[PDB]
Amino acid sequence: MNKAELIDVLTQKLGSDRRQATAAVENVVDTIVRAVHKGDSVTITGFGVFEQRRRAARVARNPRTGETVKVKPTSVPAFRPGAQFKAVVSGAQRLPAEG
Amino acid sequence: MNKAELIDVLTQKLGSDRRQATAAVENVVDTIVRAVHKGDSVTITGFGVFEQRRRAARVARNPRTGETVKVKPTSVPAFRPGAQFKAVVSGAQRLPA
């Protein structure tokens, strides 16, 4: 699923026009990204937690020379899948049914 | 930021009712989860890629008993942060102003 298709899907669920669904996706993404960039975590309960992490000084291998090099700490985004996302994908919980 | 706060911010950006922003968040979530569930990946370009992976043959120590067991294989969700999401968080690229 590419982003346009995500938007087509969301359009039918929301009963919006496509521009609205596009705005929603882009602005969900942007809200998340700006929070994390501030060092805040974002918990979308059930789905997962987006956060910023600070990778300590560590080792990596320099592709162009093959030498191991010690690279500097780096702040990185991460997502921890929440229990319900995991439960569903692992087969331990069924997806929501019409109700 | 909690989910309700994400919804409040989205309500404000979209100029919608809160109920609509709530639908937006929950149905974005459901669309992603369900695609990963059927084994497909969802690429939200810039942001990242949600995917399903198969963990096979992993060991673990049952911290109840202390004994090392092989854990039976499981399919798991994952998210790979996108190039641009990393570039903002790392400080490489500035956010749009």
Which DSSP string corresponds to B62-88? -TTT--EEEEPPEEEEEEEE-HHHHHH
Residue A22 corresponds to which amino acid?
Answer: T
- Look at B95 and A33 and tell me if their CB atoms are within 8 Å: yes
Cβ–Cβ under 8 Å, residues B10 and B28: no
The total number of residues shown for chain A amounts to 99
B49 touches chain A (CB under 8 A): no
- Look at A36 and B3 and tell me if their CB atoms are within 8 Å: no
Long-range contacts (CB closer than 8 Å, 24 or more residues apart) made by B37-45: B37/A88, B37/A89, B37/A95, B39/B75, B40/A1, B41/A1, B42/A1, B42/A6, B43/A1, B43/A2, B43/A3, B44/A3, B44/A6, B44/A25, B44/A29, B44/B82, B45/A2, B45/A3, B45/B82
Chain centre distance of CA B12: 23
Cβ–Cβ under 8 Å, residues B83 and B92: no
Question: Which residue in this structure is represented by tokens 């790979």?
Answer: B80
Task: Please give the resolution of this entry in Å, rounded to 1 decimal.
Answer: 2.0
Nearest-angstrom CA–CA distance, B82 and A87: 25
Total domains in the fold of chain A: 1
CATH of the domain at A24: 4.10.520.10
The encoded tokens of residue A7 equal: 């938007």
How would you list the strands of the sheet with B74-81, edge to edge?
B42-44, B48-55, B74-81
Domain limits for position B12: 1-97
Strand partners, B42: B50
Q: By what method was this entry solved?
A: X-ray
CA dihedral sign, ordered A86, B28, A46, B89: positive
HSE-up of A53 (CA within 13 Å, CB side)? 10
The encoded tokens of residue A68 equal: 């191991």
Cβ–Cβ under 8 Å, residues B70 and B57: yes
Query: To probe the interface with A, which of B17, B33, B37, B38 has the most A CB atoms within 10 Å?
Result: B33
**In a 10 Å sphere around its CB, with 0-12 CB exposed, 13-18 middle and 19+ buried, how is residue B97 labelled?**
exposed
Residue A69 corresponds to which amino acid?
Answer: V
Nearest-angstrom CA–CA distance, B7 and B26: 10
The encoded tokens of residue B56 equal: 């096979």
Nearest-angstrom CA–CA distance, B91 and A74: 9
